[PDB]
Structures are given as structure tokens and as C-alpha cells.
């Protein structure tokens, strides 16, 4: 069974946690202990191919800025997450991408841009803007709503599809 090591990156306040938690936690239980091992590993069927997702989310460790390379180095694929109500988190995306390319020593690292919605304030990043940024990088854009679970599967599954397409070559 193939295992995909995925890494979630983004500014603090983005609800990066929520994304990963909503993926892993069962579709109708709101309960989560991050101390156990099932917290970050999920078995899933994507395009008829059963596989194992291992998701690294270091939410809360953003101030350990010199550890980003260490964490990034562990991943084959990356979710770059911003919040649609935080323009600064959107602008920081450029930096995360550059740092990932540098760590993986490659121009063509499997990657997806994710814009997450939760609660107030209202939107400051229109989806068009994010579609344009994603197109300039040549990566997919997925918009998600943590609280309703909309787009969460699509975000992670699209990243796996990106890794498969990269490994063919």
C-alpha cells in the first residue's frame, strides 16, 4: 500500500489545523486527541487506488522559523494554506513556495494552494485572485470551508493526484 507524506504550511490563524482535523476525524464525530498515532494517518481510496495519507501539520510552531526547512524536508507534497479573510496570509504564500522549492531542490514540487473559510471577518481575497496566483505557479487551487467540511477531501486528494502525476514523468 502506497504511503503519501503530506505537509501543511501557512500563516498562523489560517485554521490549518481545522483542515487536517476535518480530513482525519470521522465524518460525524467532533472529537480529536492529537497525542495518538491515528491523529495524523488515514487510509483512503483515491481514483480506485487505496493508499495511506500521513499528514504533518505543525500549527502552533510558526515562531520556530528556523525549523521550517526541517519540517518541509519530510514531505513529498505540500498544501499551502491561507485564509480568505486574511490578505497577509495570502501574500505570504509566495515565501512558503520559494522555501519549499529550495528545500526539495526542485522547480516542480507537488503542491496545491488552499484558501480556507471559517468565521468573521468576511472575505478579503476573492477566489479569482487565488486562481490567478495558482495559475502563475502552475498548481491547483481549492477553496475549503472547515466548519461545513466543503472542499477538504478535494484539497488533499488533488495533492495526491499531483504527486502521482509527478512520479510518472
Amino acid at each position: 500500500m502506497t504511503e503519501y507524506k503530506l505537509v501543511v504550511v501557512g500563516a498562523c490563524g489560517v485554521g490549518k489545523s481545522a483542515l487536517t482535523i476535518q480530513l482525519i476525524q470521522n465524518h460525524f464525530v467532533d472529537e480529536y486527541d492529537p497525542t495518538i498515532e491515528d491523529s495524523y494517518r488515514k487510509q483512503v481510496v483515491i481514483d480506485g487506488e487505496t493508499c495511506l495519507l500521513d499528514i504533518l501539520d505543525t500549527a502552533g510552531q510558526e515562531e520556530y522559523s528556523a525549523m521550517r526547512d526541517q519540517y518541509m524536508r519530510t514531505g513529498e507534497g505540500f498544501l499551502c494554506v491561507f485564509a480568505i479573510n486574511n490578505t497577509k496570509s495570502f501574500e505570504d504564500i509566495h515565501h512558503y513556495r520559494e522555501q519549499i522549492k529550495r528545500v526539495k531542490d526542485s522547480e516542480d514540487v507537488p503542491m496545491v494552494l488552499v484558501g480556507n473559510k471559517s468565521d468573521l471577518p468576511s472575505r478579503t481575497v476573492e477566489s479569482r485572485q487565488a486562481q490567478d496566483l495558482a495559475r502563475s505557479y502552475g498548481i491547483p487551487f481549492i477553496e475549503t470551508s472547515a466548519k461545513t467540511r466543503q472542499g477538504v477531501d478535494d484539497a488533499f486528494y488533488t495533492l495526491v493526484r499531483e504527486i502521482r502525476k509527478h512520479k510518472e514523468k
Binding site: S17, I21, Y32, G60, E63, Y64, M67, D69, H95, R102
Partner: protein, 462 residues
């Protein structure tokens, strides 16, 4: 017979337990045989915080550490005062039921409230430093209290209040301080290779231990270090992280600014020796600040440097890196199995607190009624308790005030911004060891003293 309390009309804590106001986890409290509260209304939580049948130290601690997400300090004080002021049930037909009720309900409950006040003022005094009126109200409530059984606790609370408004030596002998090329007092020559690697590790372990010990639960609960007021609410945690970051960066800088290959090998080798001592001291923050530097993108790519690292030190570095692999699996197992003194890596705790708070609802609903999710808070308090268990035991090492100062005032970035500085480190990496197929240049030596390490074993006995 049960008791016969007042009606809920005249006293809100008499309301019976039901599925709509309090619910429990299936298992029972360790050591104590008390039920574990999963959720309840704030009234029911306060009832159980001050419960008549038994004391609940664990619930009291957990509650006072975590209540502020669901109840403001002013509201808590109002509720415990309300709890204290118990009316007597309707006239005795005049005292069988009244002396019983006074002794087995009123008095126990009143003592439990006083216990809460004591613990609040002793262990969470910051609520009072931040809200002077809250302290005013506590002091005028404590003056209200009249009973002779109460006298001793009232005295004690007043004594704690007074102490709290007011503004290391060893068990046996610490080991002899180690010097290499730099002599004592000559702070101008201090550097990575001139100080003794043992003493670098010891003095960094002392700094990082004090930094770890200063971080309080108030800086962590509610994930406050990630919010816009983080500098206001989590100053000690942030200082601690910035130190760690500074040192990782200083290690990177020492490496890539040593342009001569032989010298750079000596630098990396010396940094691995410091790691070995961190590992001996169980300074896992130290261990990780070295591991982070070595995995950094300017350092990791230096294949020519790594090639010349003696195999023993390669193995040391590889073992340390493996602590971090598979979501800190080996680090976690190692930490569980050692006793103080140590310096944990804080990042794991931060992530676990955040995810606990984010991944669980603030309330649960039952029959249309909103109950505070207390189990969520318990989990956070478990993490802050695990943090606190490594904060009590100091290291048996002498401070060297010059070496200490040297590491406190380290500033590898200087006046530069982060992006600018890390780009400089990376461009320096590219200069000293270009990408294939470009050949390796030579660079002149910068160090006019010997590069040989004194090693990692103490010079003198005991």
C-alpha cells in the same frame, strides 16, 4: 433520605442532576474514585467545583487553569459568592433537619468555596494583577466570612494576598567549568571554536532551562501565543522560542561563513560535539536547535563538508535526527523514560494544545441544552501539567556569567530582515560549494588558532 435543599427559585445550585445539565465520562478519577465530568452548565460545574459530598483537587486545578474560555473571572467570583450564600429551607415548625443541613451541606460547601478562593489567589494570581476590581471584590467577600471554622482559611487567604502584592546553590558540588582556547574574562575572543564545547553546551542548557521554566499556563491556554496579542500574553514563551531560533541561525552562520573546507569541517564537527553534550544533559531543545541547523537548506546541501565528518559524529547526528522522524516518535518515547532535570522541546506541546482546542467543540448539546465541554479543557490541562513536571528541577551546573552573556547577546541576523538573512546564508552556501557540475573552489583560512577539539570528556575529576 437525601437532604432536602432549597428550591431552585431561591438558590440555583439545588437543581437536580440531569442529562440536560451534567454528563460524565464512563471511567472514574485516578487514585480518587470520583466521577469524571465530561460536560455541564456553568452552574453545575461550579456546584461540582464546590461539591458537598467530597473534595475534588484535580477538578479544582483543571477548572482554575482553563475556565476563562467559558466564564470571565468577574463572573466566576460572582458565582462562587452566590454558591456560598446558602439560604435555609422553609421554617422548621418551631432542629433535626437544620443542624444536619448546616453540618453536611452548608459548612462543607462554604469550606470548598474558600478552598477555591485560596487556590485561585495562590496559583492564578494574574487574574487579580490584571483586574484590580476583581481583587477588591475578593477582599470584601473574604471580610464578609463570619464562622469560627472559617477563621483559619480567611486568615490564610489574606496572608497569600499580601505576599502576592510584593515585588541558585546546589545539592552537592557542580562540575568544574571547562575552558579551551579563550581564557576566563576575555569575552572578546569567545566564539564557537574558542570556548570549550562542553561549556557551550552547559551554559546554553542553563539559559534554555530558565527560559523553559518561566513559561506559565496563562501564556498557553486558549492558544494565546498564536493570536494578535501574543506579545502581550505570551512574552516568556516567545523569548524562549526566539532564543532557540537565534541559536539555530547562529549555528548555520558559523558553518556557511567558514569558507575554507577544512575549517568548515571542524566547525560542523564541533557543533556535533555540542549536540552530544546536549544529549547527555537531556537538553532536547538544544538537541533540536542543532538538528534544525543541520537540516536547514544552506547547511544540508554541503556534501563535501559532510563527507569529511568522522563516522562517529555522523552517527551521533543521524541518531539525533531520528528523534524527529515519524512525528517525534523516538523523541516522545525517550522523553517519557527520563527524569528531571531536562529541557523539553516545546513545539510539540504547542501544537497539541492548539489542535485540542481547535479540534473539539466548545459546547455539547443534549435535549436542546448547551453544556460546556469540560473534557476538552481537561485535555489542555493535562498538557500544561506535563509541561510543569519538568519545570521544578534545576541543573547542577555552575553559571559562568561571561559565557552566559555571550549567548544571551548573540544576534546572528544583526539589522537584517529574515528573508534577506536566510537568502544571504543560502547564497553563501552556493558560493562555498557550488551546484554540480561546477567545480569546488578553494578559500583561504580565517582562523589563526588551532582547530583541534579538546573533546567532550571532562578535564578534571568530580
Amino acid at each position: 433520605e437525601q437532604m432536602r435543599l432549597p428550591s431552585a427559585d431561591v438558590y440555583r445550585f439545588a437543581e437536580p442532576d440531569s442529562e440536560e445539565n451534567i454528563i460524565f465520562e464512563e471511567n472514574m478519577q485516578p487514585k480518587a474514585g470520583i466521577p469524571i465530568i465530561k460536560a455541564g452548565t456553568v452552574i453545575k460545574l461550579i456546584e461540582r467545583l464546590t461539591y458537598h459530598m467530597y473534595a475534588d483537587p484535580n477538578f479544582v486545578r483543571t477548572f482554575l487553569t482553563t475556565y476563562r474560555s467559558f466564564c470571565k473571572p468577574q463572573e466566576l467570583l460572582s458565582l462562587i459568592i452566590e454558591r456560598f450564600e446558602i439560604p435555609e429551607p422553609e421554617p422548621t415548625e418551631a432542629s433535626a433537619e437544620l443542624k444536619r443541613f448546616r453540618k453536611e451541606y452548608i459548612q462543607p460547601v462554604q469550606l470548598r468555596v474558600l478552598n477555591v478562593c485560596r487556590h485561585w489567589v495562590e496559583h492564578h494570581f494574574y487574574d487579580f494583577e490584571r483586574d484590580a476590581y476583581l481583587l477588591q471584590r475578593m477582599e470584601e467577600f473574604i471580610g464578609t466570612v463570619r464562622g469560627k471554622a472559617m477563621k483559619k482559611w480567611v486568615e490564610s487567604i489574606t496572608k497569600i494576598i499580601q505576599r502576592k502584592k510584593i515585588a541558585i546553590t546546589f545539592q552537592s558540588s557542580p562540575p568544574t567549568v571547562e575552558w579551551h582556547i579563550s581564557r576566563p574574562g576575555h569575552i572578546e575572543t569567545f566564539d564557537l571554536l574558542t570556548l570549550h564545547p562542553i561549556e557551550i553546551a552547559r551554559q546554553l542548557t542553563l539559559l534554555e532551562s530558565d527560559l523553559y521554566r518561566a513559561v506559565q499556563p496563562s501564556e498557553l491556554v486558549g492558544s494565546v501565543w498564536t493570536k494578535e496579542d501574543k506579545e502581550i500574553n505570551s512574552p516568556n514563551l516567545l523569548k524562549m522560542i526566539r532564543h532557540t531560533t537565534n541559536l539555530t541561525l547562529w549555528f548555520e552562520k558559523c558553518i556557511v561563513e567558514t569558507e575554507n573546507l577544512e575549517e568548515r569541517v571542524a566547525v560542523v564537527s564541533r557543533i556535533i560535539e555540542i549536540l552530544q553534550v546536549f544529549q547527555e544533559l537531556n537538553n532536547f531543545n538544544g538537541v533540536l536547535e542543532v538538528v534544525s541547523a543541520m537540516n536547514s537548506s544552506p547547511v544540508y546541501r554541503l556534501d563535501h563538508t559532510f563527507e569529511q565528518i568522522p563516522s562517529r559524529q555522523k552517527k551521533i547526528l543521524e541518531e539525533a535526527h531520528e528523534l524527529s522522524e515519524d512525528h517525534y516518535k523516538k523523541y516522545l518515547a525517550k522523553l517519557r523514560s527520563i527524569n528531571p532535570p531536562c529541557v523539553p522541546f516545546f513545539g510539540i506541546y504547542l501544537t497539541n494544545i492548539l489542535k485540542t482546542e481547535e479540534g473539539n467543540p466548545e459546547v455539547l448539546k443534549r435535549h436542546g441544552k448547551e453544556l460546556i465541554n469540560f473534557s476538552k479543557r481537561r485535555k489542555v490541562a493535562e498538557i500544561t501539567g506535563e509541561i510543569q513536571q519538568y519545570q521544578n528541577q534545576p541543573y547542577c551546573l555552575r553559571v559562568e556569567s561571561d559565557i552566559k552573556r555571550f549567548f544571551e547577546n548573540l544576534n546572528p541576523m544583526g539589522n537584517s530582515m529574515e528573508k534577506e538573512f536566510t537568502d544571504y546564508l543560502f547564497n553563501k552556501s552556493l558560493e562555498i560549494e557550488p551546484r554540480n557540475p561546477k567545480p569546488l573552489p578553494r578559500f583561504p583560512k580565517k582562523y589563526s588558532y588551532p582547530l583541534k577539539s579538546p573533546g567532550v570528556r571532562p578535564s578534571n575529576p568530580r
